[PDB]
From Swiss-Prot, chain A:
Organism expressing this protein natively: Listeria monocytogenes serovar 1/2a (strain ATCC BAA-679 / EGD-e)
UniProt xrefs under InterPro entries: Ribosomal_uL14, Ribosomal_uL14_bac-type, Ribosomal_uL14_CS, Ribosomal_uL14_sf
A molecular function GO annotation: large ribosomal subunit rRNA binding
Identification of the protein by name: Large ribosomal subunit protein uL14
KW RNA-binding (keyword) present: yes
UniProtKB/Swiss-Prot annotation, chain B:
GO CC terms, sorted: cytosolic large ribosomal subunit
Matches recorded under Gene3D superfamilies: Ribosomal protein L17
Family: Belongs to the bacterial ribosomal protein bL17 family.
Keyword Protease: no
Signal sequence segment: none
Gene name tied to this protein: rplQ
Complex and partners: Part of the 50S ribosomal subunit. Contacts protein L32.
Family annotation (HAMAP family): Ribosomal_bL17
Upper lineage: Bacteria, Bacillati, Bacillota, Bacilli, Bacillales
Alphabetically ordered keywords of this record: Ribonucleoprotein, Ribosomal protein
InterPro entries named in the record: Ribosomal_bL17, Ribosomal_bL17_CS, Ribosomal_bL17_sf
Name assigned to this protein: Large ribosomal subunit protein bL17
Cited PROSITE patterns: RIBOSOMAL_L17 (PS01167)
PANTHER family assigned: LARGE RIBOSOMAL SUBUNIT PROTEIN BL17M, RIBOSOMAL PROTEIN L17
UniProtKB/Swiss-Prot annotation, chain D:
GO molecular-function terms, A-Z: structural constituent of ribosome
Entry keywords, A to Z: Ribonucleoprotein, Ribosomal protein
GO cellular component terms given for this protein: cytosolic large ribosomal subunit
Species of origin: Listeria monocytogenes serovar 1/2a (strain ATCC BAA-679 / EGD-e)
Domain of life: Bacteria
Signal sequence extent: none
Listed GO biological process terms: translation
Keyword Ribosomal protein: yes
Keyword Nucleus: no
PANTHER family referenced in this protein's UniProt entry, alphabetically: 50S RIBOSOMAL PROTEIN L32, LARGE RIBOSOMAL SUBUNIT PROTEIN BL32
SUPFAM superfamilies: Zn-binding ribosomal proteins
Listed name of the protein: Large ribosomal subunit protein bL32B
From Swiss-Prot, chain E:
Membrane spanning residue stretches: none
Domain of life, source organism: Bacteria
PANTHER family: LARGE RIBOSOMAL SUBUNIT PROTEIN BL19M (PTHR15680:SF9), RIBOSOMAL PROTEIN L19 (PTHR15680)
GO cellular component, one term: cytosolic large ribosomal subunit
Family affiliation: Belongs to the bacterial ribosomal protein bL19 family.
Alphabetized NCBIfam families for the sequence: rplS_bact (TIGR01024)
Phylogenetic placement of the source organism: Bacteria, Bacillati, Bacillota, Bacilli, Bacillales
Protein keywords: Ribonucleoprotein, Ribosomal protein
Protein's name according to its UniProt entry: Large ribosomal subunit protein bL19
One Gene Ontology molecular-function label: structural constituent of ribosome
Biological function: This protein is located at the 30S-50S ribosomal subunit interface and may play a role in the structure and function of the aminoacyl-tRNA binding site.
GO biological process terms on file: translation
Length: 122, 122, 206, 53, 112
RNA sequence: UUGGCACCUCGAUGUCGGCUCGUCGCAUCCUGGGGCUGUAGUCGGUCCCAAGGGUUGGGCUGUUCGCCCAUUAAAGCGGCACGCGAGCUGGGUUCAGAACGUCGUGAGACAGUUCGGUCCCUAUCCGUCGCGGGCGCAGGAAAUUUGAGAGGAGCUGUCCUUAGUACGAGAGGACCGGGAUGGACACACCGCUGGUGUACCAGUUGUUCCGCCAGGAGCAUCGCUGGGUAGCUAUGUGUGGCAGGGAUAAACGCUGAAAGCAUCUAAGCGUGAAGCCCCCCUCAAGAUGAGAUUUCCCAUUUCUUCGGAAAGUAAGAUCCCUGAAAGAUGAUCAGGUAGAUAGGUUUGGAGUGGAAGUGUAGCGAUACAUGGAGCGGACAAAUACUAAUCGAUCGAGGACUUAACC
């Protein structure tokens, strides 16, 4: 349940640390995003020496959310923080490493390098 | 359940009062809504009396008002409503399963047209 | 085409062979009987009149008693016609069990929705509340009736009133399980109406 | 929010068709053949369902 | 309801053990591809067990890689191959929602 | 639109912008159909038919407009007192205060600016949205219904494949078709995730009380706090707009003259749109045109010179009463001893979380056991113990003509 002005920690090695959402993609009045859904963002907090930096607009993927997901088997995955991953025009990251856990909905939506690089997918 | 023009404090007070009064006097003239609630309340007290356990007595004493029915020269010793409940009232219905209380419709009150009833414990 | 009447017992959920989890409404459809068979020559439309529950002869009356005695069965509580149905089936007096359906068979469920009372517009018709601050004294009111020129307000301007009780059909639901002993039918998802409500299940038009 | 016109005698009366009140649902006591309210205790004989009160 | 119970009685897994909130469990859960399966282990603490019958659920909480995770399962899934209770925990609440505003050394549940 | 006129209104027709609610037109923004192309394909330009549905969220400004960021299939133009202030706001503006610059000897003023600044009304009628009562519908009743007519919905992307096929020197890259998955929207429901849950459970502070300990109660926002039943519900779940027929628009054509050819038209045939009528959902016989089917009660007695009446009944229905799945009140629905309608009681159940008392250990706080205990509004099933007692009231006796049956 990520919408405009929502912030998200960043789960990858890129210079971004904290991020704000500009635009949930996927239609006209699409007002919230869930896991596996891309969101146009800005960088509000950066690490120095990073590729990405303060004030840069960039597309990014929601990777873990407090309001999580239900699976067809009747099971729900929830996290204690909302985190994002910054990506290119293809569905690949800009960073090299990925921190913290991750959800299989990305594996479903073909974010496979993210699924791989992350340590624990749940 | 029935609210009776009263907020929770006042309602509970009312029911404690009315129930103690029916245990004491065994017949009272009230309105039919108040009556249709204190049937539940009072009969749930009669169950505690039929059990007679200390635990049931404490549980009831949390509800019944501490006030006197009469005094008895054993030395003048007062009796209380809880004593009348467990020692006098409830033994009367040891063999009766439920339904310790009836309501008889009387007629309307003058100053407010309220529908009044006699409630008594048989 | 094939149909029954039933009572809504409630909701639960069931695991299928895949391990997928599927909510289901339970329909108890006992005592279904065919009472009359309407024709184009007698009436003008072909249909089958089903009666669902047995009830008591003191809650009944002598007219209903006669109509069911022409079927050789007891008075009934719910009686309903089904159309777009073959009449070479359904002999009078016949009992109409849930075994006419099958798992994965696909239906329309028709019933009378639940009763919300007198309601406002934003709940009933989905309108938007006006602000609750910045000076607003307009929160849950309906908005403009319309413009000035008519000297009147148009029909279908939507306003408060009694919300539910309306008849509703839900389409393309799936039958999960059939239990002829319990006279029980399971339906993926929901149906309209409270518990103990009548549901009219029939083969889907599409 | 204010009347544009005065209600006439007829329209007034046409509203007042329904303000009436009903004959009360009473009947005669089996014991005292004297009118009383159904499901209520007779105030004359003080008796109900064949049982004094 | 009794009728519901009578129907859902067949799908009750009796292989599930007695467990409560406070206790650590290991869930051998199935994760399924279009034609394949892996069993993956979710070892963590039970916070809540709500519901009745096959409408009963429990949630198991974990901290993986400095992030808290909270995974809910129906009790009677066939996609739990096994559920191993490890540590039983004295605890005074049925709903352990306080563990979310707590990181380590305060989330510690006392064993018995 | 700028304007012109000054015809209604100065015994008051409230202004810009926004919010709520929309509705209409088409000069169509998108989706749909088509002709021309300086149309290779992709994309496009222009024009015809189409108003079915859809047509974003933010930064600056009081702002409309406009610029910008980011999306979109698209971010339409306009009318309705540039729609809507007895529906809301009241930022701007032109009420009183004060100040700046400027003009004025001055008082004072400025489509110059800035700060600050009271938006009254109990809805009579129509209208609108919902609910009832009365009568009618040539006997009186109970149920099921046709469907005139009327409303609703009507949107759409992305991915795969066809096929890297057609086309193209390459770069690139289809039509038509088949399928999967989404957005927004609508409806329903609460089994799941959650919320709420002021007569469920627990912890706990202060103080007063229950004579004291102990256990509990009152007040302190329900004292605060952690949970939470039913019910209500979304952010949650299920489904939906699928597939389509008939006749058309623009358009393409067949045959065929008028006019020995030609011509899509004149007679006559076919194709042909998200549109029209249907299909799908809902209301609907007050549809006074008052319909139909099934079943039930019967042809009473007084009168009246006729018409016509009243006065007890039948089938049936209600006053009254217990009530919820229902509900503003009515109504509806479930029941009224030929009874499980409600309360209680007994079993359980969710939920809470391990009662009290006793005992043990400990200096004590407290811990442990007895014992998934105790408590448990609305939940479930049984139980007639309590109250639905006994009564009372309304409710037909069925006009005339014709035809066919007879
Ligand atoms: K004027
Ligand atoms: K107005
Ligand atoms: K009962
Ligand atoms: K104890
Ligand atoms: Mg209080
Ligand atoms: Mg809004
Ligand atoms: Mg307010
Ligand atoms: Mg005037
Ligand atoms: Mg005026
Ligand atoms: Mg046009
Ligand atoms: Mg501003
Ligand atoms: Mg703005
Ligand atoms: Mg205006
Ligand atoms: Mg205005
Ligand atoms: Mg006005
Ligand atoms: Mg102002
Ligand atoms: Mg000025
Ligand atoms: Mg100002
Ligand atoms: Mg008003
Ligand atoms: Mg009025
Ligand atoms: Mg729910
Ligand atoms: Mg205290
Ligand atoms: Mg003490
Ligand atoms: Mg005080
Ligand atoms: Mg055609
Ligand atoms: Zn009497």
């Amino acid at each position: 349940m990520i919408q405009q002005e929502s912030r998200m920690k960043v789960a990858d090695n890129s210079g971004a640390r904290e991020v704000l959402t500009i635009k949930v993609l996927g239609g006209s009045g699409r007002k919230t995003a869930n896991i596996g859904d891309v969101v146009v963002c800005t960088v509000k907090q950066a690490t120095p020496g990073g590729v990405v930096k303060k004030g840069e607009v960039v597309k990014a993927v929601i990777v873990r959310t407090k309001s999580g997901a239900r699976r067809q088997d009747g099971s729900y995955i929830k996290f204690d923080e909302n985190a994002c991953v910054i990506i290119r025009d293809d569905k690949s990251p800009r960073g090299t490493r990925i921190f913290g856990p991750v959800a299989r909905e990305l594996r479903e939506n073909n974010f496979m390098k993210i699924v791989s690089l992350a340590p624990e997918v749940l | 359940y029935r609210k009776l023009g009263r907020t929770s404090s006042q309602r509970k007070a009312l029911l404690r009062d009315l129930a103690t009064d029916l245990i004491v006097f065994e017949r009272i003239e009230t309105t039919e809504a108040r009556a249709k609630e204190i049937r539940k309340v009072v009969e749930k007290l009669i169950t505690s009396g039929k059990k007679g356990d200390l635990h049931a007595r404490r549980q009831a004493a949390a509800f019944i008002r501490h006030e006197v029915v009469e005094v008895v020269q054993v030395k003048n010793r007062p009796v209380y409503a809880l004593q009348k409940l467990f020692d006098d009232v409830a033994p009367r219905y040891a063999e009766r399963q439920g339904g310790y209380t009836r309501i008889l419709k009387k007629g309307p009150r003058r100053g407010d047209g309220a529908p009044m009833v006699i409630i008594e414990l048989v | 085409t094939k149909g029954i009447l039933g009572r809504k017992v409630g909701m639960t959920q069931v695991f299928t062979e895949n391990g997928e989890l599927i909510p289901v409404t339970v329909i108890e459809a006992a005592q279904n009987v065919v009472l009359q068979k309407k024709t184009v020559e007698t009436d003008g439309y072909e249909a089958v009149q089903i009666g669902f529950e047995d009830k008591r002869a003191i809650l009944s009356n002598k007219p209903e008693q006669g109509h069911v005695a022409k079927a050789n069965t007891t008075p009934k509580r719910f009686i309903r016609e089904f159309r777009d149905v073959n009449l070479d089936e359904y002999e009078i007096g016949a009992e109409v069990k849930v075994d006419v359906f099958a798992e994965g068979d696909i239906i329309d469920a028709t019933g009378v929705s639940k009763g919300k009372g007198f309601q406002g517009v934003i709940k009933r018709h989905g309108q938007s509340r006006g602000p609750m601050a910045h000076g607003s004294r307009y929160h849950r009111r309906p908005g403009s009736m319309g413009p000035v020129a008519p000297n009147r307000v148009f029909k279908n301007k939507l306003l408060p009133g009694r919300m539910g009780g309306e008849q509703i059909t839900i389409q393309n639901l799936e039958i999960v399980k059939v239990d002829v002993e319990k006279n029980v039918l399971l339906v993926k998802g929901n149906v309209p109406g409270a518990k103990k409500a009548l549901v009219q299940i029939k083969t889907a038009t599409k | 929010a204010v009347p544009f016109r005065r209600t006439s005698k007829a329209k007034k009366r046409k509203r007042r068709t329904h303000v009436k009140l009903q004959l009360p649902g009473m009947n005669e006591c089996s014991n005292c053949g004297e009118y009383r309210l159904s499901h209520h205790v007779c105030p004359e004989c003080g008796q109900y369902d064949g049982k004094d009160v | 309801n009794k009728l519901i119970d009578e129907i859902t009685k067949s799908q009750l897994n009796p292989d599930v053990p007695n467990f409560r909130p406070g206790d650590t469990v290991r869930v051998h859960a199935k994760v399924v591809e279009g034609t394949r399966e892996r069993i993956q282990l979710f070892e963590g603490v039970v916070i809540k067990r709500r519901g009745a019958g096959i409408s009963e659920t429990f949630t198991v909480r974990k901290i993986s890689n400095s992030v808290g995770v909270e995974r809910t399962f129906p009790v009677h899934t066939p996609r739990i191959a096994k559920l191993e209770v490890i540590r039983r925990g004295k605890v005074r609440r049925a709903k352990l929602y306080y563990l979310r505003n707590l990181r380590g050394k305060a989330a510690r549940i006392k064993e018995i």
